[PDB]
Design a protein around this ligand. Sequence first.
Ligand SMILES: [Cl-]
Length: 311
Amino acid sequence: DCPAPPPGSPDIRAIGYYTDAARSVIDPRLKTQNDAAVKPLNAFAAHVAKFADAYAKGADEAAGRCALTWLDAWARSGAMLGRMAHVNNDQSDYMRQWTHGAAAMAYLRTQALASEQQRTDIETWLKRLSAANLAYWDNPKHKRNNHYYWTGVGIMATAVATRDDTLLNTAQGIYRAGIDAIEPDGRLPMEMARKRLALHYHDYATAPLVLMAEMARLQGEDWYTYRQGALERLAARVADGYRDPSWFNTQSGAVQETATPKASSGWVEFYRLRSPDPMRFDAMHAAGPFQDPRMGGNLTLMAQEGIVPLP
Ligand SMILES: [Cl-]
């Protein structure tokens, strides 16, 4: 039931796989190469989320403890705190952002079961990852698109799990940077620049923003009041776009790739409970249930049961 914690190397060597300026067309050879290079990272995320979801079913404290054993093993090896090797882009940094998010979400969900040593080990590691991922964004040449918002997932989950007001403020700034970037017509310009993937990337940018706001409810706060309505305009564009892509087609200059909502689209499971117009999200909700390790696991269940199971 609990496989051995897998190796948590300090180092990452991921491979970018888009061929065009708009990062909208995939080179399948490079995608296959990247998949193999980052398999340990994706496997770690998938398993800690699987264990957290199993813990959330109840009567399975062993599953929660399994997630903590895996997290503690990576914390003790200094996983991801070494070299972010750069081959053709910053894919290694993006992988550290997403994997920190998965790890921090799993810790947030399972930490009630942590030993004293596991809390110290894991929290120290998650704070070191927060600082390292934040520092990446100090260079203004790193464009603060959806990768920046995704960085906020791990920072926010670490902030809540450690009750760190400084990290909570940092995460709030990242969330608000995304909200502030929404234009009156609902677009996020850096995601609209992704041609046939413009809808996909508006969905993918919405995901971490919603998840951050949902984690803020764990501290009693309602982040949807910040620039209230702006996130709704973006979310409504996404839902509309799955029905009729004509606005994304015109504004992006490309016919959108045909796709069903999946995985991280499960932000809708939370957001439909917050929106003033919930029923407009029914068609996206019907594509569920939604699971994404980078968001903590089963979004459909967490929206009903809460992100953190209670003991
Ligand atoms: Cl290298």
